Design a protein around this ligand. Sequence first.
Ligand SMILES: [Zn+2]
Ligand SMILES: [Zn+2]
Ligand SMILES: [Zn+2]
Lengths: 364, 1168, 115
Amino acid sequence: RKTIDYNPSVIKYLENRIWQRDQRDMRAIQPDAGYYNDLVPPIGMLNNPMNAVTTKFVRTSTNKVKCPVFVVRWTPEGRRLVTGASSGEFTLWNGLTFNFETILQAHDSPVRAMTWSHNDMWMLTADHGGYVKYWQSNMNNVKMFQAHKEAIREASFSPTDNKFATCSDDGTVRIWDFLRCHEERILRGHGADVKCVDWHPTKGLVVSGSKDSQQPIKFWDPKTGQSLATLHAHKNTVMEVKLNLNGNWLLTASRDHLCKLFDIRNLKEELQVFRGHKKEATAVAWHPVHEGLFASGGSDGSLLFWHVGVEKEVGGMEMAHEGMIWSLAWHPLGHILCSGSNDHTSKFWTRNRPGDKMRDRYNL
Amino acid sequence: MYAVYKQAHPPTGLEFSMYCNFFNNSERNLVVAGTSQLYVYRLNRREKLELAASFSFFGNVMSMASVQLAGAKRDALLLSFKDAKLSVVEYDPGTHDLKTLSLHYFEEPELRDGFVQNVHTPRVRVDPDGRCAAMLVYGTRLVVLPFRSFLPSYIIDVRALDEKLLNIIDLQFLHGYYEPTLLILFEPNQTWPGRVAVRQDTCSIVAISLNITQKVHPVIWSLTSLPFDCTQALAVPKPIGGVVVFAVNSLLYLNQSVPPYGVALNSLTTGTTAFPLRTQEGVRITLDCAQATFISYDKMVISLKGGEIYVLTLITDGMRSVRAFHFDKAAASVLTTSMVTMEPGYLFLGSRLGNSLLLKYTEKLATYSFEVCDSILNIGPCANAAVGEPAFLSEEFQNSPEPDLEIVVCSGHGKNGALSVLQKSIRPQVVTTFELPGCYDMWTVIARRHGFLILSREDSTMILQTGQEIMELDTSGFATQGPTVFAGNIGDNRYIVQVSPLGIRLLEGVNQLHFIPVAPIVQCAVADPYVVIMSAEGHVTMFLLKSHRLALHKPPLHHQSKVITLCLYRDLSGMFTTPTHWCLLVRENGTMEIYQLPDWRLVFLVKNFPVGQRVLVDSPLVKEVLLVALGSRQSRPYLLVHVDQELLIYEAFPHDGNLKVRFKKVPHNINFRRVARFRYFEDIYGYSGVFICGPSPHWLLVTGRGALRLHPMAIDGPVDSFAPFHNVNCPRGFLYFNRQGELRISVLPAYLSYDAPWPVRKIPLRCTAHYVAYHVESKVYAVATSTNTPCARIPRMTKEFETIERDERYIHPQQEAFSIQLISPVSWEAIPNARIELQEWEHVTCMKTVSLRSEETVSGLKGYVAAGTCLMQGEEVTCRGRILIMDVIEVVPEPGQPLTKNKFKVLYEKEQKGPVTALCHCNGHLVSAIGQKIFLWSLRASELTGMAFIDTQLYIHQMISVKNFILAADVMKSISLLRYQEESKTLSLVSRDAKPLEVYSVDFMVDNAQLGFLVSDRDRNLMVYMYLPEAKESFGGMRLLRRADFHVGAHVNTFWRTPCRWENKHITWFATLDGGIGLLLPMQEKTYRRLLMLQNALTTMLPHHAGLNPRAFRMLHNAVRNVLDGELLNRYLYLSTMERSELAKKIGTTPDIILDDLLETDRVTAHF
Amino acid sequence: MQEIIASVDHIKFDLEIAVEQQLGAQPLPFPGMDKSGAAVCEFFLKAACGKGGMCPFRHISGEKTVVCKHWLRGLCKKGDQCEFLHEYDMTKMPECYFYSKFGECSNKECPFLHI
RNA sequence: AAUAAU
Ligand SMILES: [Zn+2]
Ligand SMILES: [Zn+2]
Ligand SMILES: [Zn+2]
């Protein structure tokens, strides 16, 4: 059966590292079928982000419960992919052969958030009922409490994991203390459902995307609870608010078929807009290694790969996935990408292999 | 916590080359630069390169170019450093250094457009007309630097041209245009070799006319259908004009007024290029990583991947419209990183991963044949190092406490892959030792074989007649009633002169001609036919060989101040202008005065010589001075002066009736903390130079390469005297006295080349050396090597296989076949029939010598050799590995081959449950990372039983243990820390770095009680972690906290520790991936803090090459700078005494204390 | 060869001292946790830990024989109270279900004991 | 034994 192993590519890259100082010494991989061993992980080919446009299809991972997948997340080491379905199930799939391992019952209500702490230790979640739970790397629940009284749509850890922020349909963003599990402050002011929250990598911001057209995106202060700024970016219902790990850009994705790259340092000037989604853009995933490259999951199922600086899309698979995509998670190496879908399924995509007539149904 | 970084071996391996007018406009020079070094070479006509000048930068060069600015007398150098730095440097006569003309910073945060990770290197270009310049900064900004010497530059937002240029591949300055025209090869819509069915051909070329005055840059001659795989582009010279694009499987010629002309090379372009391409005949190659250059307007030389050299001709009609191409496979050569056509008939093939060699071509009787004239030694990428003890050590030196070691490196790659047997010091092969008491000074004369040997005692003098048998004499012919002050060869190795306090005697051999009576003589130097003797009160007398018979001629000298020393010189190569004889001289007041011997007119003067100025220009307590010509035909003189237990050595360069010469000091690491101290040997194993006696003996060698080399003789302690030797039983060799009065007849070991900075031997394996391990029992090295073979099968899964069948114009991928050799230290030749041939695709991921426990040996450990392999068959075939534990045994040697007494014994080999990506031992166990886990096995008789396994990360690739703690390392995530409790078979994670990091290697920084984990980074950073459970950032030791930081200028992949020659601290040596070797020596808080002040003063109040900053260079990638910079701190020793005192008083410490702190870091770092 | 020139057996390290005394080890929160991969308590083995249930490290008992098959996979929730052995000794592994009941063992890399 | 083979 299919088995995408990154060990050959990591060993080849470890071999090349010794005598190749950059890409300028990398011998050209040729578009021939007999060049299977010339690949390296995206870490090797760094100034050609084109390689990690994962358009090859590996396998479709489905459960026997058949419930829509609202969140997919890779274990910090990549050993397995966890899948938060709409029934509370935590299906775990292998990280090398993408095969079923174990199915749990974490939450009574649909899972909507799943964030692995900035260290491997902890894995927060959240469900439609507002409950928040703590998990260990052995999938053992450690503590549970009700954070909000309405469905939590996202939860994001701080640079140091002592605090995390959550957003609910109640229209407020709350900031909690990790160990004490006690709310600190309610960041009120949006006035309607909040659909995303992302804690800035370092500076300690809390951005949020809301369903209200008046203040679609707001900037908060974790400590004082103020409202540092407001942004009228999109027309309606910002679906995903993600921050780049470099701490400069904020990429949104709204229900107006658009994704906009913003510079947090300069909110007055719109930096870039990504046209090309035929329907609502409901998912985003920055690349773990390539800063600038990201995927995008439309509400029509389309899956597009973008880059910062290029006017047009780098290249994706329209109709990559039935239903509407909910979340996308790159493998920690970056050579695989799992896409959650409203169609009770998730799919694994990997980089193309040199020397293939790209006649697949997701390609041509 | 605290440390100091010292550099042991300077990086080897060039990166850029050019043939410019560096020194003057008359003769051109080859300027080659590595990473942080610049070398200016010459050509001496056998054709041998000669080094002219070398300079070190506080940065890593990323490009190089030259310009003949308006009105200049030289060629300016447009160096470029990382993150948009442009430095225009120039040679400086009168200081023999690189002065700086204009340094441009472009590190504004708004120029990067919000990209933190920079993956683009600056690329500097110039017009062939010398009118302009450019620089591609961050891959989107183009710094146009107009030339009239400079004009206010400006920045072109390349993304805001008439057409936005993205993913620029290569840019060149074109020929034969009215305004500086720039070609841009770029990909508006990037693609990947593995994704070419939806983006077939994505490339373009655009030419923009740079209007300097009006700052307008229109667009002309755009093309938009080039094949996607376009690696570079070259501008054809003026007579033809245009540009050639070097596609991977194609070659194009483009001009604006004519249609394109492209020819394919190999039939891998059938469906990957819709560009109209011909089919080249009789050629199948790949221009993917290939240097190139133009012999003339018509022919260019290409050096592909693999080193093959071609000579392409641009067949053209009378209209100069290129009509056809013509290749021909000329003589193959090294893997080249650069190339430049030096002379009309010469070429240079620079290389980093292999020796860089100069060529020479001649017409065949349209067709050329390439020979080789010279090569540059290159310790290529140091993949590994296995410290071991030298096979041969003299039984005389076997009784020393300090260990004697050597390091064997896996240098080079591919056809140039080899091993490098690096050593630091000189180890004489003592042939015979004579216990002679009292005598301290000696001289070996010639009567070429050394007929005699004169020894000096307190009261008497005995002479040894060397030859068939060395035996003391008893008859007349020499003075024996008193000590001898000098005895050497006058005439031409045909007469004997010995100097005694009562006079000077001239001997024809055994017999004596006559005695010339004469403040007892204290020093004498002879330059044939001139003999000069200096008395105790400073008097100087001159003697000439007037026919033979020495003649008296009192030199006319006005002694304003007494003469303290004096030296005699005889220049054969004309550099002391206005053979000739010069009498260097040092006066009491501090003035040095080169004189003229035939006449005696003053010819030089320096006001304060003992101070140690970094350059000497015309108009304390110096003890000995020696000026001697070193190099080919004795071309470049050097001045060596011994002042105040400190050695400073001046070079010599010319500069315009006083002497048209000047002397410049050269860096140094020798601390000296009447018997001469500088001994000149003309031929010792084919080498010429000076031996520097005293507390730290050192050997000064410089070959026809002209580069100075200093080598220590630490073994046997200090050296009193020294002398060259050539006997029937003893070939060209030396003879020195020991501190214990032990005369030692010696000969230099013949298997080492003392031309490199460190005595090295290159063992060409002709394959890729991957690992190396030393087995302590049987004292032999193992080596893992790989050779490339065409791949004719594609592994698949269902196992099955598919055969690769194509047409005759097909390029076969290079599959790697692995094998483990066994290199005998005795002769450095692989052991026949002792080789392990691994499976077809098995790639040796790791190999180390492992001390598994055993009961047969008296100790608790045995010391087998352990390896871990892995079947690489693409990302679709499951990856599995094998642990191979081999023991080297002894067998009765086969007659005629004494080296076949060793043979690998395969105790264990089994297919594990995953790739064996790393290996190590812990207190007699075997720890191995098999996939997502680390196991811990116990050595049974012939099996391995598992003890304790834990899950770590994606890919562990480097493990190491101390007593019970295992320091794993991940390719992406971080280092870890695991602890084995022996009482209960449990492996526990003590701590773990919480931040992502691309690690290269790991080791241990060992202090008395605290233990730091030295880690190497992809970005060339060295940092030390710690496990401190009582800090706040680390909750209970859960996090590892960085306590030191340093940005080394090179990638480091291997470490090893050696105790300081400091109670319980160990040095942590490393070898960088560009041929360098450095240290990391721990230090005390007081020492570090009192040397940080000196470091800050050096950074601030000193001018640096190219105007760079030392402090900014060493900042990591937040920064905790607890590692001093021994390379920058070394410049404090370079400074004069006056500047040292000024800087010391400025920072608030005394110069003597600062020196004591600086010199101990060299005393305790004199291993190997 | 590394242990001959530079030996680390006569040096008492601050790291050794720290891990010996469980220095700076704050009691873990949420009594219901497992904390797999943690060393065994060096104090509970001699007299007593004094932080029963709250100990950062592991408290062991000499009763279990069969190796926990879930611990091998890396997901067992019982942890410190696991009713099955928690070491890599591959001689008390569970008997192969397919071999014992459903004929033979389909996979040739099975670690479960065959009887 | 809690999904070892979904
Ligand atoms: Zn305890
Ligand atoms: Zn268990
Ligand atoms: Zn079985």
